[PDB]
């Protein structure tokens, strides 16, 4: 619990901060010092900014600086440009007891011109070159599907609301819906297989694949190739949680080996377990080589 308290104390000071992601030349043409998803959208945005687009963003900044979620199980970290508020990056640590447990994911956030009349645009960058569709609502291309973002089917009350919806609500919905312990059932049609042996078997297949992919990208590629906006955050988080990470990966290796005897899916479990062991050895080496922040 002392580790939890230290994580709360340290990462809280690192939850919200500025970062120089955008610079302009002598004429004013935009040039970016970090990777970003909406390059064309940013470069094509006009200067006819609505006052609401600034007031709402300032109020959201106050709300984020005051009440960003924070726990060693799951936390939200936000970085915004020193000059442009409409561009942001969001780093989320996966809640425990899920295939995303302790995995850190980087998101690119853009605000459209008519914001807050329309939901903002969020894209995922931790897909590992679009290799893995980490969630049924999170396609490998980086698309994020949510009712509040109008990118997922739902009732109007679940949709975007310029008067009541907020970015904090979006983050809470992301944590509560995408990073769940049963991502396989998020897909339509698959949710009705919940409780059936075939549905549970397919869920275990998907969860093993997601676990190995998370270890590969959301942990190993993050420590090896950290994003500059979250470099200190990622190192501190992995150093603080390192023992839990190795324990969790050994537990996952033990869990996936339980289904290696399966004939429908067992070979996939064997392949994912071999990949997980390789990535676990690599992660253990990296954590042993990781200096104390």
């Amino acid at each position: 619990k002392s580790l939890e308290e230290k994580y709360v104390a340290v990462m809280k000071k690192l939850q919200f901060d500025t970062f120089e992601m955008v610079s302009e030349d002598e004429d004013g043409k935009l040039g970016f010092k970090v990777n970003y998803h909406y390059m064309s959208q940013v470069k094509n945005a006009n200067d006819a900014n609505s006052a609401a687009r600034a007031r709402r963003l300032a109020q959201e900044a106050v709300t984020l600086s005051t009440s960003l979620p924070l726990s060693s199980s799951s936390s939200v970290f936000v970085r915004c440009d020193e000059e442009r508020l409409d561009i942001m990056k969001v780093l989320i640590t996966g809640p425990a007891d899920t295939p995303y447990a302790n995995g850190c994911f980087e998101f690119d956030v853009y605000f459209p011109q008519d914001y807050p009349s329309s939901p903002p645009l969020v894209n995922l960058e931790t897909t590992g070159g679009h290799s893995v569709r980490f969630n049924p609502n999170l396609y490998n291309d980086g698309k994020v599907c949510l009712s509040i973002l109008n990118t997922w089917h739902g009732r109007p009350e679940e949709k975007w609301n310029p008067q009541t919806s907020s970015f904090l609500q979006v983050l809470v919905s992301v944590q509560s819906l995408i990073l769940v312990a049963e991502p396989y059932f998020n897909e339509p049609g698959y949710e009705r297989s919940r409780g059936t042996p075939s549905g549970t078997q397919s869920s275990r297949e998907y969860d093993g694949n997601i676990r190995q992919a998370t270890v590969k990208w959301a942990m190993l590629e993050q420590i090896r190739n950290p994003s500059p906006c979250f470099k200190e955050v990622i190192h501190k988080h992995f150093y603080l949680k390192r023992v839990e990470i190795m324990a969790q990966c050994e537990e996952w290796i033990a869990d996936i080996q339980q289904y290696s005897s399966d004939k429908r899916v067992g070979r996939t479990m064997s392949h994912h377990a071999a990949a997980l062991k390789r990535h676990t050895a690599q992660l253990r080496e990296e954590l042993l080589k990781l200096p104390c922040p």
Partner: protein, 1012 residues
Amino acid sequence: EIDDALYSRQRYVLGDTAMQKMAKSHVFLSGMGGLGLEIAKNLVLAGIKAVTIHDTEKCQAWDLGTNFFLSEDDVVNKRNRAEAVLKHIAELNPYVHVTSSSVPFNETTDLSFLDKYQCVVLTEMKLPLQKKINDFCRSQCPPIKFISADVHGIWSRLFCDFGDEFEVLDTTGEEPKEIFISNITQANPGIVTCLENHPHKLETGQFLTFREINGMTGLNGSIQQITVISPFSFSIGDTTELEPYLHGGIAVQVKTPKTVFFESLERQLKHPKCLIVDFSNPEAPLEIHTAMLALDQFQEKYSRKPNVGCQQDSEELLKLATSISETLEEKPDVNADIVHWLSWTAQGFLSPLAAAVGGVASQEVLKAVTGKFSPLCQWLYLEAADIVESLGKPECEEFLPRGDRYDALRACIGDTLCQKLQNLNIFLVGCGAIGCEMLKNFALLGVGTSKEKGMITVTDPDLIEKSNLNRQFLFRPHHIQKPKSYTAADATLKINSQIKIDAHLNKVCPTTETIYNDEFYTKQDVIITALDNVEARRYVDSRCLANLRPLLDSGTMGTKGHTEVIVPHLTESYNSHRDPPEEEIPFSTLKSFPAAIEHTIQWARDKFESSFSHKPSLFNKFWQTYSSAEEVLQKIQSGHSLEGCFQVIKLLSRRPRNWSQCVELARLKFEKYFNHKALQLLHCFPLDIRLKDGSLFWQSPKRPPSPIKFDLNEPLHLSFLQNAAKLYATVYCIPFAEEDLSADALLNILSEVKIQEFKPSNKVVQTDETARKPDHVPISSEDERNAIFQLEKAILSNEATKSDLQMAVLSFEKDDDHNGHIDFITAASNLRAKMYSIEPADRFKTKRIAGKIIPAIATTTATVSGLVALEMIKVTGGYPFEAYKNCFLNLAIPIVVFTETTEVRKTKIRNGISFTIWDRWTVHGKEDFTLLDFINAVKEKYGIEPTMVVQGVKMLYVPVMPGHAKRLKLTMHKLVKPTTEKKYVDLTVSFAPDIDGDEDLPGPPVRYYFSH
């Protein structure tokens, strides 16, 4: 036969039944002043078969200020007024047989020759002669419709008399309404309840007909008269004897004919039925009628109009008005100011008011020969007293004539206001019909004719089309496919050679903001918009609000029109209005469950776009992104997920190579669209399937689809096949001839084509009316290997050249009939309607709806242009807020409503300080001036401390942002990093609310200057 290519916009207003009656009507028009010329022009543009203009007066120099066809040569030759303009009028519409006459009119004149005319219009005629003619006209069998119109200075009079009884065939231009029935009870009277989500929107006493009613099957085909109970219920009479209701039911509104009564002109002078146009003065029209009757009696008594500034004439006119007023039924008090101004401006002639009255009178004439709308009953008085009321008591020397062409307007508004008008700089956006009429009004008023300052700038990018000749009267058949702005500018100078006009082809948009910068807007004094869309209106309104310049706006939808007046520091801007947008049809309703013909039309339009605009563009883009099909094969074999590769492969594998294959593809598309879809939907939802509550799924608004069987003998099937084949051949660049379109060839070609047997898939059907179109379905491995095989076969068959990998893209042309886009859309929509038992539409309605063609007529455009030009005078004169009048009119009823423009709403910010949308705070600084200095200066100047500073999209300073308190010490130039072009910069500021946790209160925009 109606020339649709010329008349379509007017047809969408009037209808074929009315137009086929106007083709057999003769109209007699007397008096060729400004008002008579406007009426004649509107009637000729409308397409009346025969018009007989008549006038006995000769041309004078005074006439040039009211007539836009006369020339100085006409005055030199002393030609007859009617014959001097007969030649020019005929050019407006070659289909119209215009004639001229000059028979003297007086007491001894024989009126028997008038019987050959259906309608008679009299202008600038003595009252007793009008009385005699009206007595003769209404006594004929059938009665001759009588209309009288007059303009005296700033006062106008319009009168109608359509006989003892007039049979109106349609009380309004609204389409008949369809009401879906939710429940009906067996009661006396039976209470009918519509679907609870849609309002009743009907009135007691109307007639409805019923169809598709289950349970009470006897109500099918019956006609009932309803009584409104609630905004969602009504009663149609006793239904207890009927069967028990089950479900369904649709009621249709029936347009019953209505009879309107009129009275003789001589008796109508007492107790006149006057149309109220200003509800703040419900008794003004009666006073105006009394004053005009007194003026006519003065003309009878003295054989001359009152002289301007003559107190004796004004006193005599007041005495006559007082004597006349007591004879009326109501005995109103004589308005001294109205009589005084009528005496003051008796000899004047205000052109914009004349144009507005001419438009209204022409609409009444069109109603007279068709009965398409409820006519005026009976008097209508339009005022312009606001123009001269703000002048106080100007001297008579301002109004005395001086010999130039502007004596007509000088006697109306005085010399100083005319001088102000001549020095105006007006930026006219859009050169449509409203723009052309406004340019004609400018030419008549002499706007910008001063050699020192006056200048008019008109900009429009569109070219002249044949359909524009119907209402944009400045153009001619030989001006087709030439710029609107250039042609209008070159035509305007003929009306008034002293005018100075500049024409531009630029579209008004942010991309062209460089030309129309703030310095240009500062130069202009008034901005007038004749736009046809909303986005450009909002952009122009924002620019005018930024530059603090008045704006005049107007728009016409058929017989409805409105005028918007915006004045700095006085009225709200156009952006302050946020009326609800067009309601989108639900995606599930459009794709799967259409209820009305409009849904099928929209579906056909979307299908056409996706088939000939979207997918060919994607094909071209895909084959330009990747060079060769072999490269695509190598990439997909290595797992590369090229953007939409499988769809492009599917398009490539189905590419036709000759006309026969195009016909086969069209046949397959017909089968897929109109047989397989219905079978799939019925497989998902059988006819007897029931919901969770046990109610039948197939009930209103949903309708059960029926599979259609192909049959080449039916004209609709042949039309669809021909259109689809031609469009696909054009897209695939397959050459063809008209002989290939013969039904014999199509039958011979299709005889060898096998029709694939249908199989039911299990695709999810979206029944949610709140859902939208889902994104791409994940491609299965089977589809992947099928695409691989298809493109490998294509490569083997050498179908991989650049010609194979490019397709022509078709734009949705709608004005031309030979391209066949409208034909294809009509055929597809009618077939889809036949699927769901929806009543089929026709080609013209499909053209109107699919093309989003806004109905328009010349009369409404002329009226709104006259009103806008009238308000332009008030804007130029700088009159107080009370003088400006927003207008909304609908000539169908007819109804004209004047209303004070919306007052600007002060927004309280803090501690009693308030600002308006026109406000903009300013701060002057220097290079060592800092952000903290900026905050201190703002707080000192306006008594309130800023809480955040924003430079457009860039954030300058927000307290909650870490490390931004350091920016207070930074110099303004360094933190802004501005360009040397601008001496200033615009920032957005917000302030602290009274309550903690509330959003920062938005302040007015702030302009900071980098130097003093």
